[PDB]
Write a protein that binds this ligand. Structure first.
Ligand code: CA
Ligand code: CA
Ligand code: CA
Lengths: 501, 501, 501, 501
């Protein structure tokens, strides 16, 4: 198809796409490997906030008791989160705090979730929980100052509409939990932004009921959160993998758009919507995450997601993750943009490529976005999602582009099934679970995008680009003005160099 | 032609090719840019020695006088070589010291060489020159230890057979300068290895006569040094460039082979031969240095030069160079393997590819070298040197390589006119002289070798590679055992992932 | 009194004292904090080996069971020890491997030890344990090379004579565990050094019985391991401390001596003796560890312990530890040489000071060690251990040292109750449990030794040092050659500078 | 002297004292050593601007001709200043540009200044000099953008009232050069701040005459610049030293104040005054720079200089400097805050101490400055400048400070003749010209300030500090609130640790 790019544009592409990114549990942030991947992510994409589970779980170790004279008394150990949040602020990223799970010494029952056994029961004593929240938020303000902590966000719990994350999926108990948390947070400082309900899909009446619980009972709410995946239940499991079919990306966009409509009808029509988890599959052992398809699929969501929501947070930035035990191989289906040994997966490159876009929107359809940057240069990202099996399945794109600058330097970066894909080459190596240093460096070189460059002289103030994208390709194309300095090199003749003309 | 690679090899490919590398003047080693380049060269190519001019020239500033009690007395200022030689040893490289040029306060005349004005006249007092040599050598021993300094090499002066480097190209004055320096060095310690005569090509009788001089007067000598280039004097000039025609690589190898024979017919038949400079062109402003042709040309030399000499030192590791003034553009025909902003030029990847070869030499002709490493893997560099003008001129090559290892992972890296080639992309950018940071990063990215990988199974203990090499391509092919772990992934099926089979 | 230092010494002070250092459990090696601590320790102290628990425990996560073709089969996950052992080797340290504790899926019972719950029961199947040992040692050889792995050591289990560490303190069942482990290690490669019984003090008949067991059933043993502490059982507890009284250092040296003699009477008289754990207190929450007293105590051990044993491993290099939960304040009584935030405790300086000592032992008594270095310089460590309460309690020492110089430069470094002691300043700060960054930097600053320097000219070939050591001071004195260059500064007069003479 | 420090102050202590710092010539900024020093200075004292000579001198290399056809034509080589200014900005410092000296290819005559021979003659053609300024200023805008370059400052020449720096000290010829330069800069962009006349002391009529010339003839001026020193001509020289008597600090402040009054009476009454160089001695080989006296002298200036001027630029940040050849010894009387090897001099610590001061001024006299900061802590810098000879000469200072905070933590840092003084210890080592790495590390350690800390309890709402300062001491005293956490450590008893009470 032939697309004619207009010279200027009315609308502005937002940075909503990189507002937030997900993570494995906060206690894993103590790992050097974790910080390795986070530094890479902050250099090449730079997210504003980071969101995961386990702030209050026992590895991070904040809530204890502590026998004094003859009675159990609370003790708040900030050793670990002080280091964790410090390490975050040093990398220019703030916590999108999630309060959870339940500390053991505060839990009412035995039910846990994950390999790491986060306790998912309500607190035995709601006043002890309140006091925990006040202690934690108060500490954060003591350490980092009120101005800093006022920029953070505070979600209460996680997926209370699923039985695995909250006892009996108890709607009313969660609302009580929400109100105690919300009010405890405001009691420390009224500007702090608290929100919920952090639910998985399939049950959006919870968002209607949540916002009505808060209206009726005058309970604070500053944002709404929901999670969004497109995978069905596993159709085949091995001992290490879940395999799942996926709905197309418009299904996710519809989810975003549907939840925003439910907010617009509610008694709090102005509330921000934060999609605090999203990916194709919701399982950390689904190999789909390691593929070019995942990138081409996510590219579509990056292009449009921000039209409906204030943020959507890719779960996750890193394979440093233990919800289903320690990764059993290098490419093991983890959620991360970044694989162990800081090896970028195809999806990472899609973010990177979006990070080259300018604020000015020239054109956008279901397979491309075209922008103008301040300097006058064009930056476009194009993608060829093909969810069906088969080879070939190429897509041609004909881009007529307005530009006054008489010559143009075009730099294209590509990742697809052949290039920027460490997963493909890892198969060639024999799928080493625990590869050598040298196999890993080779995987790191191969994981880099394939670059091609050209110079093109304009005809009639317009350039034509013929772009062939192969199956599940995502590509960045930057088009810059050539200020040719050749004529300053007086006498220059390449033909005077052996072999050249 | 079909190349049958034997499974075993008797001969051993020596590491002579990276004994020593060349540099711009030692005062330039104080620059941060210099040290960035050397760090990159030492990580990707481990050179043992580094050889350049200007140890005794005035920017380094060792030789001074100094009015004390009505008398002009020597002062030896080691502030700068201390720092320089320290930085060398920290990067695991030792100085192939070159004694020169003439300190101004000790010069007999006015004649200089280069924009930096190295003085090229005899010492006004030969006893003060000797005292200089003794104080410097002694200083090295006091600072670093006798054992360390004893592993160094000491070449005396530079190209005395050229009027530009030595007043009148005075043979007997040079032999005298050599003699005073050689005895000065030995008087500090008899195991310090001293040599000469450091001549350019064109007059090899100087080697014959030099050794007859040392024989008659029993002047200590421990190696013969010589420089070797294949460029004719320039046939065109701009304010910016010297352009030169080149003879083929066989011309240089014959120069090596000629000088070795001359040492064998002499009264010191066993002397080591160090070619302390080599490249295609001897001009630091000949663009040929920046091209893929240079890379293929030199790969020929890296493959065989060690057959005839103990070392051959590429002039130079880096464009940090001022013989013909500060560089006037990013790619300005400088000698270096690395360009400003630490951008590898194509020749750098030739050195890097040779660094991947094993000790065991399995096969070699005029266009390839195939080797076996200690772990049984195969490693070959192939080049397609085309000096003639024109397009295409591709060379197909057929390989029959034995490996009992029944499946194989092949990693190929290529640098040619299209890949690994910053120069090409600089030109497409309009030859920016002083590029932006953004342009430099793109040129760095494009400067990386293109990588192709495949898996292949052996039929009958053997693999057959059909390889295509474009114009002036150099390429590294590594062939590793696949230890396939796929069977341990029970129930793995890529066809259960969206879009894959 | 007065000490006449002899100019020459017969004896050598051995490097035994820094052969090995202890660590918190291996899974903690994944922390950034841990690795910052190791780097500091490896730069300032030369440790060769690193010994700790948890290798086979479930955080590191090697042993898993996995359902394949309808049976429970072993899966060995090397993801984490690959990264751990990689990071050890990159910092020039190798594992003193300790095979333990019991993986949960292989345990025969439910008894655990520590906050992190390592299982302390026998394996439910000894053949599976064996296959576990074999798979781990084989994986090491595969990744690191057989020559690398042969330099390691392999301890079997931990304190099997203590009921907390091993079911019933079952002697005969530990011997069985040793045999199955030792024969499995030898089956992989016969050079691999294996030993035990890794007992705590109080029941040294276990060494005699362990060696008689290995003699009678021809079981491979390459060393005897043993733990040494001087602390009585805690006489007071708070919710975060154990306080304990200590025996003097001679008690530890006698423990070393008495165990060595037991080896020499047994059927393996020549076997190496590795004290794989030692410190004053055996509790990771006894504040004595954070004090100048600890450093004074342990310096006496460093000075003599090598006389009796091949190695004695200070438990531990770092407060990065979790046996009794996450540290509840900055200085919490941890074992570490280094405190969180890379703050060196006084004991760390004791090790640093011993790292400056020379080979040649000139003199030693129970309060000093005086040595000569290869360059002729003198290095001495002195300590004033004072276990009794009160102020003052100084030791005046007089040293008559010979030197072959004529003028000398004396650099003294000191750590005591006032200087190089962050615990004291932490107290002055109000004992902040979770100090700010600003406070931490102040604590690091103040943690640095105090330095005093002087020049002193000899008389009659000799130097008379008067030295005052304060309560529990450890101090380094280096006496070096002055090569006065003042005479080359002709006309120099500090009296011409404003205010000076 | 008993000082009662008020609770609140009406005035602000300005940041003018670290607005700018001086440097050796801009070409030396290419040195790794230089950037090591700049980084350190920028980490501990964050200066905003850096001011030095030689931008247009031929080592940096900007101006060349360049034979084309048969005519000499201008070529502007931006290779080196691009690297220099990039490195400045990456370290958060901007150029206070000084246009000079004269490029040889533009020079009218052959007179030069310094070891490095900057040419101090007018341009042969003022149109060529204009075309140079336009090319340089324009290139700066092209690379860094117009907003950034407008924050810089542009001074014309150096000390044109001194015959050494400018042919004949020709007043009218400098005004002509100012006019051509100023108009040139303004023709690129009118908001660029240009000024002069950069004079040395002893003839302040030049400032009057400059400003009248600019008013009458409507030449752009945006600031006045002037240099200030207090050293008399040398009374003794050696081959390597100038020794000079110093006027007291009142003389410098009186210089500042005098020039400010001349501007206030001029036709441009409101012009900023920048003192573009200042120190005690004006000679780069006067040992006084290396001393504690220099530090105590400069502190009075840092305390008050900002009263009269908009900036005052300490000449220099670093001993990396070649005006009078390469440093002949480690401490050689160089201008730098930082000695070679990154060793801080006593004067460096003065600046670091001032960098801890708060904005709100509580109390100031001629020997101390006392401030409050945002968090409520008190920071004070005290100094005891003694310019006469003699030992002892201690100053007792009694501070009576208000705090209701219950108790306080006092951190004191001292640099004087005994502590923080590497010069003193370098002499003890026998004044090594070219010390070993090991002697250098010792001088670094010894160069760190001496720290003392204490907790003091508030009696009656007031803390009474008694501070004995030794001769030529400068010292920082921070007083913070103790939030005591001791009572949360229930049961804590240091008396339960061996030896402690
Ligand atoms: Ca040079
Ligand atoms: Ca532990
Ligand atoms: Ca200079």
């Amino acid at each position: 198809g032939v697309v004619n790019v207009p010279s200027n544009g009315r609308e502005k592409f937002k940075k909503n796409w990189k507002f937030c990114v997900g993570t494995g549990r906060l206690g894993l942030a103590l790992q050097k490997e974790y910080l390795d991947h986070l530094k890479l992510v902050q250099e090449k994409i730079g997210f504003r906030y980071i969101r995961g589970h386990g702030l209050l779980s026992d590895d991070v170790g904040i809530y204890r008791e502590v026998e004094i004279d003859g009675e159990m008394k609370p003790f708040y150990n900030f050793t670990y989160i002080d280091r964790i949040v410090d390490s975050y602020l040093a990398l220019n990223i703030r916590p999108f705090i999630e309060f959870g799970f339940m500390p053991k010494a505060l839990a009412s029952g035995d039910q846990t979730v994950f390999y790491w056994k986060g306790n998912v029961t309500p607190p035995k004593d709601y006043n002890k929980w309140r006091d925990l929240i006040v202690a934690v938020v108060s500490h954060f303000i003591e350490r980092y100052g009120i101005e800093e902590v006022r920029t953070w966000l505070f979600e209460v719990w996680n997926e209370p509409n699923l039985v695995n994350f909250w006892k009996d999926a108890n709607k009313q108990e969660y609302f009580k939990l929400y109100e105690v948390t919300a009010r405890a947070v405001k009691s420390v400082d009224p500007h702090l932004q608290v929100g919920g309900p952090a639910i998985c899909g399939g049950s959006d009446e919870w968002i209607t009921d949540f916002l009505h619980f808060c209206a009726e009972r005058r309970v604070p709410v500053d944002f709404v959160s929901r999670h969004a995946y497109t995978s069905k239940a596993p159709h085949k499991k091995t001992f290490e993998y879940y395999y799942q079919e996926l709905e197309p990306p418009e299904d996710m966009l519809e989810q975003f758009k549907t939840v925003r409509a439910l907010i617009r009808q509610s008694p709090f029509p102005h509330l921000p919507l934060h999609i605090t988890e999203y990916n194709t599959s919701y399982s950390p052992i689904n190999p789909v995450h390691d593929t070019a398809l995942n990138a081409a699929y996510i590219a579509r969501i990056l292009s449009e997601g921000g039209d409906y929501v204030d943020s959507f947070s890719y779960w996750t930035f890193s394979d440093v993750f233990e919800e289903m035990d320690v990764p059993k191989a290098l490419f093991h289906g983890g959620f991360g943009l970044v694989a162990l040994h800081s090896i970028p997966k195809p999806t990472f490159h899609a973010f990177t490529f979006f990070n080259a876009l300018g604020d000015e929107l020239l054109y956008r359809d279901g397979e491309m976005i075209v922008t103008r940057r301040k300097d006058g240069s064009i930056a476009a990202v194009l993608w060829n999602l093909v969810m069906e099996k088969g080879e070939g399945l190429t897509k041609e794109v004909q881009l007529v582009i307005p530009v006054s600058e008489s010559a143009v330097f075009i730099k294209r970066q590509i990742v697809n099934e052949q290039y920027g894909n460490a997963w493909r080459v890892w198969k060639q190596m024999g799928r080493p679970r625990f590869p050598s240093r040298q196999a890993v460096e080779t995987l790191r070189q191969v994981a880099q995008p394939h670059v091609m460059t050209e110079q093109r002289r304009a005809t009639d103030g317009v350039i034509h680009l013929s772009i062939v994208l192969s199956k599940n390709e995502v590509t960045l194309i930057e088009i810059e003005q050539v200020r040719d300095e050749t004529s300053t090199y007086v006498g220059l003749d390449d033909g005077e160099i052996t072999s050249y003309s």
